[PDB]
Structures are given as C-alpha cells and as structure tokens.
Design an enzyme around this catalytic site. Structure first.
Site, PDB file in Angstrom:
ATOM      1  N   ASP A  34       0.681  -1.270   0.176  1.00 41.69           N
ATOM      2  CA  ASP A  34       0.018   0.099   0.057  1.00 41.69           C
ATOM      3  C   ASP A  34       0.954   1.895   0.199  1.00 41.69           C
ATOM      4  OD1 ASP A  34      -2.460   1.318   0.135  1.00 41.69           O
ATOM      5  OD2 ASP A  34      -2.588   1.515   2.472  1.00 41.69           O
ATOM      6  N   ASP A 220      -1.232   5.673  -5.106  1.00 43.92           N
ATOM      7  CA  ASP A 220      -1.644   4.068  -4.765  1.00 43.92           C
ATOM      8  C   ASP A 220      -1.732   2.989  -5.256  1.00 43.92           C
ATOM      9  OD1 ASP A 220      -2.877   3.336  -2.219  1.00 43.92           O
ATOM     10  OD2 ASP A 220      -5.211   4.721  -2.331  1.00 43.92           O
TER      11      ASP A 220
END
Ligand code: 1SQ
Length: 377
Positions: A34, A220
């Site tokens: 992440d 992201d």
C-alpha cells in the site's frame, strides 16, 4: 533483483500482497502492498476471514510499545496494539529489521472475506502514519538499519489471480521498455504528484490544471481505480461519454452504480479513447505524459450467479480527497518510488495488456508553463 521478480500476488479488486515474516521464529503472513498509507499492521486475532494471524506469544523478539492505535477510514476501520518485532521479506532483500507492527485486535470492513492477505504494508511516509509521525514506517526502518538503497519499484500486472513485482532497493530493467520519466514527489506524506494537463483521445479538457489536483494527486497501489476530483471527474466523463457516443449506457454506469455487459469476445475496444495525464517533469517548464487504454479503466468483474457475459466496472470515479492513481494507472506502467531523490519514475511496463492497435506510453519532453500553479495549497 530476479529474486524479487514475481513476488506479488492477488485477486482482481482485492489488491496486491507480498509474503513477509514477523517475529522469531518466523511467522509467515501475506501483506497488502500500500503506497497510500504508512502503517505496518497485521491481523493478530482469529477473525474468521483470515487464513492466519500474528501470534505475539510465539515470538521471543516481540516488544510491546504499550500503546494502541485507532484507524478509521471511509466506512471501514481497524484498531490495534503497537509493538516492534523482527521482520523479513523472503522474496526481498536478504536482511531482517526491527519494525513497528500494529497488532490488529478489532476491525470493521477491512479484511476481505475470500481474500488471501492478513495485513497491510504502508509504504508512504511518517507524516500520515498513525497515531502520529513519530511511529517510524517500515521502509524508513529498513533503510536506517540496512544498506538497502532508499527506493522501491512496482510492476503491477494481473490477468482471476493477479501478479507483479516489488523490487525493494532498486530497479529491474527487464520490467520495462523505453525510458523512465520522472515527476517530483511534491511533498513527503502521500506519494503526492502534480498533473499539469489531461487529454482524452488527444483532445484536452481545457480545465484549470489546479482542479486536476484538488486537493491532492497521489499514487496509490491500494486503490483499484483512477479516481478524479468532483469537478474534474465531472468534465472527465463528459468528454469520455462524448468520445464514446457510438453506443449508449446509463448514468449510473458512469457513477459506478451499475455494471455494463457486452457479449464474450465482442467488447468495443475502440469506442473508448486513450487517456493521457501530463505530469510535472524534473525541469522548469518541462512535462511528460503517460497514456492509458480502456483495458485499464474498463475492469472486468470476475463472474456472477445472475449473469455470464463480459461485465466490466468503469474504473473512474470521484473524490473529495483528490486524484488517485490506482491500479488502473499503475498496471500500465513500471513505477519507481525514488525516495532518495524525491521523485517517481514512470516507464511502459513489460507486462501491460496491449493490442496490435493502441498501446500504453510514457512520452516527453513537453513544454508546459506555470506547472506550479497546478498545485493546490
Ligand atoms: N490505500 C489505502 N489504504 C487503506 C485504506 C484505503 C481506503 C481507501 C482508499 C485507499 C486506501
């Protein structure tokens, strides 16, 4: 770095995970990669969706920080107990480090039922760590305690099961073709970048570029979609809808409230335009562009009991927190998170899905004036 090639797995929509080990003796866990957050957090109790979890009682090297963390997101949440322990990445550099770990003890809408991951590796910076920027993120600990260079790169592929590579400490040139082009990390909190121009099909949105970045643009790996701010998404779909007038679809579709189905082997590739984001370059008045195809913004939804066609989710959507370059963007490219030089590199990925027609590209240089004005303050 061939040791690290193909060290990522996943399923469509459920993110990309890497194998890690925690504690002594080593406990194996699959951990979501992440770039959109900065905590290393792992399931630590027998939540029924989890294949496994961190058992702190089994680890001689565990240390309690005697503090809790509470992490609410939009509609989901987790909570846990902070500690440190010894952490390795089996298909990663041959090192072990003492990292902070949030032992997750309660959660809501976080873990996915049917998924094969049990924690999350926040690769972004301390500024957005929880509870605050004093909790040293993992990659920071890795770089302090070892000679691993301060950078990592991600090649996200995938189709079903997906796959990819996280090359920690370096770059693997087999993972891309042509040249890397770099955009500055505007600030070290998210991996924040600045989009200076947006073309759909070559024609541009003629929008104040400041809007493209209202209030953020970030890279992201934990988000599936290309997300665009209200006003920009508004204009964004206006032009995509117009570019694709050949065939008709509902409003809800463009709102991701409905799916759209075409018969198998018979989807209109070409009735959708290639979309291009111009990013701020390394030099004053210089930009480059990255171009994605609809196979990136049109993502299948595996299957259904109530249908059996090629049904896709429109992978573009709106935000009050900004542009999010998620898997829709990252799967077209090899992405280099060059932390040491405060920059993110983009190259055409050797594994992106292409035709004998149109193809993902990274091109430059272009001349773009007033690119600072594109950043929201
Ligand atoms: N990147 C990331 N990490 C955790 C939760 C999220 C929720 C929504 C978007 C991105 C997220």
């Amino acid at each position: 770095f061939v040791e690290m090639v193909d060290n990522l797995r996943g399923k469509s929509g459920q993110g990309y995970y890497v194998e890690m080990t925690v504690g002594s003796p080593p406990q194996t866990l699959n951990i979501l990669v992440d770039t959109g957050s900065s905590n290393f957090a792992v399931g630590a109790a027998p939540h029924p969706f989890l294949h496994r979890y961190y058992q702190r009682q089994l680890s001689s090297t565990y240390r309690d920080l005697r503090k809790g963390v509470y992490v609410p997101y939009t509609q989901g949440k987790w909570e846990g107990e902070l500690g440190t322990d010894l952490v390795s990445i089996p298909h990663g550099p041959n090192v072990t480090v003492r990292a902070n770990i949030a032992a997750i003890t309660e959660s809501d809408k976080f873990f996915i039922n049917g998924s094969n991951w049990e924690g999350i590796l926040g690769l972004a910076y301390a500024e957005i760590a929880r509870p605050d920027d004093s909790l040293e993120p993992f990659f920071d600990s890795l770089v302090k305690q070892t000679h691993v260079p301060n950078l990592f790169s991600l090649q996200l592929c995938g189709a079903a099961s997906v796959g990819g590579s996280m090359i920690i400490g370096g770059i693997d040139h087999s993972l891309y073709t042509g040249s890397l082009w770099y955009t500055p990390i505007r600030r070290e909190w998210y991996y924040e970048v600045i989009i200076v121009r947006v073309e759909i099909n070559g024609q541009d949105l003629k929008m104040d570029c400041k809007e493209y970045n209202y209030d953020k643009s970030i890279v992201d790996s934990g988000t599936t979609n290309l997300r665009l701010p209200k006003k920009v998404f508004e204009a964004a779909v206006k032009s995509i809808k117009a570019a694709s007038s050949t065939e008709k679809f509902p409003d809800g579709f463009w709102l991701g409230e409905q799916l759209v189905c075409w018969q198998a082997g018979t989807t209109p590739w070409n009735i959708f335009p290639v979309i291009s984001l111009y990013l701020m370059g390394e030099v004053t008045n210089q930009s480059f562009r990255i171009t994605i195809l609809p196979q990136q913004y049109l993502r299948p939804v595996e299957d259904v009991a109530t249908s059996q066609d090629d049904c896709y989710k429109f992978a573009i959507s709106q935000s009050s927190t900004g542009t999010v370059m998620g898997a829709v963007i990252m799967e077209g490219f090899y992405v280099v998170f060059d932390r040491a030089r405060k920059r993110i590199g983009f190259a055409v990925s050797a594994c992106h899905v292409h035709d004998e027609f149109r193809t993902a590209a990274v091109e430059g240089p272009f001349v773009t004036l007033d690119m600072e004005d594109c950043g929201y303050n």
